[PDB]
């Protein structure tokens, strides 16, 4: 019993810095066969072909790709699972995982409210920089100060980040106000930092008088920094360990993998969206992203509904 991590690969259009280098196009994205295929030299037919849960070529807008992966997750969140989406590859206009948060909360409110259901919504936003935690929704606290984290015995395989501002959200507008005044704290001059956005959703519903069903749903949106980066590196070694079935999974060897341990062979429903360059200029990074992504789809998680009757 379990669900392997859902992995989608997206290929993005050529960027202008790729045309200037005269790069040629080396990636094929076969959405119907769910295969991305890379030319490994050179005409030559040297190829390496991978299969994924979903594949998107450049013509599919980034938003549509997220949509295809997020909306189905949001229903799982509401059913009461904990879910995590890892975005790796990101960056007219081009937006990270954060840029779809207000859309996310809209659907969530819309599903809940038009269904007369009683709920609360609390959000978090932290940044992992140089192996240190930084809260991005705390307004008054000094911008250069960190957060501490220990192991909570109540959840023996999980952690607690004391000081982290959970913000309650009622209307699909507050998100914008809070979201932007969050980018205004990560401005330091961020290209090497991971951001974890978290939406927690408490839900209550009467069954028959005397009885209530209480569900809690949690979504984490992880925007992984691109490739020296302990979190990224360990993220890799965790992927590898889980798949090769080695006894010791180096979770505690980085803040990111410690924070999101349950997402990797844990009790969380996990999806990964890896974007890849079409350019021959990036064959190695592309070859890399597909290795991790390909290993990742082999990890089994065991999600459980979190609910009390
Ligand atoms: N800097 S590194 O060599 O340690 C490294 C770089 C990238 C990764 C990595 C690349 C892609 C993915 C993903 F599968 F998420 F796309 C991932 F989860 C991890 C892992 C290790």
UniProtKB/Swiss-Prot annotation:
> After translation, how is this protein modified?
A subset of this protein primarily localized at the spindle pole is phosphorylated by NEK6 during mitosis; phosphorylation is required for mitotic function.
Residue positions, PTM N6-acetyllysine = 111
Q: Where in the cell is it found?
A: Cytoplasm; Cytoplasm, Cytoskeleton, Spindle pole
Residues in domain Kinesin motor?
4-299
So which disease is it linked with?
Answer: Microcephaly with or without chorioretinopathy, lymphedema, or impaired intellectual development: An autosomal dominant disorder that involves an overlapping but variable spectrum of central nervous system and ocular developmental anomalies. Microcephaly ranges from mild to severe and is often associated with mild to moderate developmental delay and a characteristic facial phenotype with upslanting palpebral fissures, broad nose with rounded tip, long philtrum with thin upper lip, prominent chin, and prominent ears.
Role of this protein: Motor protein required for establishing a bipolar spindle and thus contributing to chromosome congression during mitosis. Required in non-mitotic cells for transport of secretory proteins from the Golgi complex to the cell surface.
UniProt record similarity statement: Belongs to the TRAFAC class myosin-kinesin ATPase superfamily. Kinesin family. BimC subfamily.
Q: How does it assemble?
A: Interacts with the thyroid hormone receptor in the presence of thyroid hormone. Component of a large chromatin remodeling complex, at least composed of MYSM1, PCAF, RBM10 and KIF11/TRIP5. Interacts (via C-terminus) with the kinase NEK6 in both interphase and mitosis. Interacts with RARRES1 and AGBL2. Interacts with TPX2.
Name of the protein in its database record: Kinesin-like protein KIF11
Taxonomic source organism: Homo sapiens
The top of its lineage is:
Eukaryota, Metazoa, Chordata, Craniata, Vertebrata
Gene (UniProt): KIF11
Q: Summarize which stretch of the complete protein this chain spans.
A: 15 to 369 of 1056
């Amino acid at each position: 019993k379990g669900k392997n991590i859902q992995v989608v690969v997206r290929c993005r259009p050529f960027n202008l810095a790729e045309r200037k280098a005269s790069a040629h196009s080396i990636v094929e994205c076969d959405p119907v066969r769910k295969e991305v295929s890379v030319r490994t030299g050179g005409d030559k037919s040297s190829r390496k072909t991978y299969t994924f849960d979903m594949v998107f070529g450049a013509s599919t807008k980034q938003i549509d790709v997220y949509r295809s992966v997020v909306c189905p997750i949001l229903d799982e969140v509401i059913m009461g699972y904990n879910c995590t989406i890892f975005a790796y590859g990101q960056t007219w206009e081009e937006d990270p995982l954060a840029g779809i948060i207000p859309r996310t909360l809209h659907q969530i409110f819309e599903k809940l409210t038009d269904n007369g259901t009683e709920f609360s919504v609390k959000v978090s936003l932290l940044e992992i920089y140089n192996e240190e935690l930084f809260d991005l929704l705390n307004p008054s606290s000094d911008v250069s100060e960190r957060l501490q984290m220990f192991d909570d015995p109540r959840n023996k395989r999980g952690v607690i980040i004391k000081g982290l501002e959970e913000i309650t959200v009622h209307n699909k507008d507050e998100v914008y106000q809070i979201l932007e005044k969050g980018a205004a704290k990560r401005t330091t001059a961020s290209s090497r930092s991971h951001s974890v956005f978290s939406v927690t959703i408490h839900m209550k519903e009467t069954t028959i008088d005397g009885e209530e069903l209480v569900k809690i749903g949690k979504l984490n949106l992880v925007d992984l920094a691109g490739s020296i980066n302990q979190s990224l590196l360990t993220l890799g070694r965790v992927i590898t360990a889980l798949v090769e079935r080695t006894p010791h999974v180096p979770y505690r060897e980085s803040k990111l993998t410690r924070i999101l341990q349950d997402s990797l062979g844990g009790r969380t429903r996990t999806s990964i969206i890896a974007t890849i360059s079409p350019a021959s200029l990036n064959l190695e990074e592309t070859l890399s992203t597909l290795e991790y992504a390909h290993r990742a789809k082999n990890i089994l998680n065991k999600p459980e509904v979190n609910q009390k009757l």
